[PDB]
């Protein structure tokens, strides 16, 4: 059964692949999240300074 083992490794490779695609999807969600968070942080700073002077 060395082609049973091979079928197991083949199934494990497919699973890891789907994890990497899922991970890549997360990272992209997180980049857009963090740009938006940065952008908001700047808007609040401009606002604070506007009330300052």
Swiss-Prot record:
Full protein name: Spindle pole body component SPC42
Assembly notes: Component of the SPC110 complex containing at least CMD1, SPC29, SPC42 and SCP110.
Compartments where found: Nucleus; Cytoplasm, Cytoskeleton, Microtubule organizing center, Spindle pole body
Highest taxon listed in the record's lineage: Eukaryota
UniProt similarity note: Belongs to the SPC42 family.
Annotated coiled-coil segments of the chain: 3-52
Modified residues (Phosphoserine): 39
UniProt function note: Forms a polymeric layer at the periphery of the spindle pole body (SPB) central plaque which has an essential function during SPB duplication and may facilitate attachment of the SPB to the nuclear membrane.
């Amino acid at each position: 059964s060395d082609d049973d083992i091979m079928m197991y490794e083949s199934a494990e490779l497919k699973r890891v692949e789907e994890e990497i695609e899922e991970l890549k999807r997360k990272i992209l969600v997180r980049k857009k999240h963090d740009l938006r968070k940065l952008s908001l942080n700047n808007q609040l700073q401009e606002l604070q300074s506007m009330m300052d002077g």
